[PDB]
Design a protein around this ligand. Structure first.
Ligand code: UII
Ligand code: ZN
Length: 257
């Protein structure tokens, strides 16, 4: 089954998931000179004060921090979005070295990692229905560079030893995702897809311009996770990113001048 190895990685996905070669795949390179300011984008509203984190799971591809999405507790609204999008999980993609790891790129620059906060459009009732719709999901993407530590990340780092291998989970209550945001909410936006199988073309991407800084010790702990299950050969969870896909007939819009 699919993964990030030489034998099962992104260049193979199209054999089981032909939409991999579709018209609105993600991630993309963001050419900053070609993206145009869109003065019509409405202000972006990140409302995470009532967020209820539940659990952290190593799914063999990344780790997901899961939220209660059975009420409007943590929502994304505004920007390019019509209606209300509920936070269901966040996860990261990262590299084996600090010079790669992000999915989106900015003028071909790769960041050390990328955070994805995944939200679904409440007009579709549940996540599984939402992913069947062209406006079903909104993913807020945030770049990570290596420098100063991110204090709000450390609770995540410290639990990773307890979910080293695929299929392990741990309680992860009372985590505040506001501690993972940068100061500015300036962004780029475009219509795209999930970046893993099933690669569904259901995402409005919102990629923040300002990266967050994390320390080398924080990212080193990400790279100690395993893709494998317990009692199986160790394969470090690194380089779990899809490279940039063709932009095709899309325009990237900027929220900022
Ligand atoms: C297997 S998973 O946990 O990785 N997952 C969730 C997901 C993927 C990618 C993003 S991202 N990088 O674009 O923000 C956001 C959410 C993939 C997924 C999404 C939608 C439906 C299914 N259902 C099961 C199936 O069909 O495998 C699975
Ligand atoms: Zn992702």
């Amino acid at each position: 089954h699919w993964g990030y190895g030489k034998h099962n990685g992104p260049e193979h996905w199209h054999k089981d998931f032909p939409i991999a070669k579709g018209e609105r795949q993600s991630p993309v390179d963001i050419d900053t000179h070609t993206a145009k300011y869109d003065p019509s984008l409405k202000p972006l509203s990140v409302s995470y004060d009532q967020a209820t984190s539940l659990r952290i799971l190593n799914n063999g591809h990344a780790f997901n921090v899961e939220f209660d999405d059975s009420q409007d507790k943590a929502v994304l609204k505004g920007g390019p979005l019509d209606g209300t999008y509920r936070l269901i999980q966040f996860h990261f993609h990262w590299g084996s070295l600090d010079g790669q790891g992000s999915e989106h790129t900015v003028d071909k620059k790769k960041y050390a990692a990328e955070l994805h906060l995944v939200h679904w459009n409440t007009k579709y009732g549940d996540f599984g229905k939402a992913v069947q719709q062209p406006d079903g999901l909104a993913v807020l993407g945030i770049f990570l560079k290596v420098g100063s530590a991110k204090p709000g990340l450390q609770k995540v780092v410290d639990v990773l030893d307890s979910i080293k291998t695929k299929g392990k989970s741990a309680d992860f209550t009372n985590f505040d995702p506001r501690g993972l945001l940068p100061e500015s909410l300036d962004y780029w936006t475009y219509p795209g897809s999930l970046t893993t199988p099933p690669l569904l073309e259901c995402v409005t991407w919102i990629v923040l311009k300002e990266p967050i800084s994390v320390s080398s010790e924080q990212v080193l702990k990400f790279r100690k996770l395993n893709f494998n299950g317990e009692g199986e050969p160790e394969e470090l969870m690194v380089d779990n990113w899809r490279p940039a896909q063709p932009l095709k007939n899309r325009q990237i819009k900027a929220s900022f001048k």
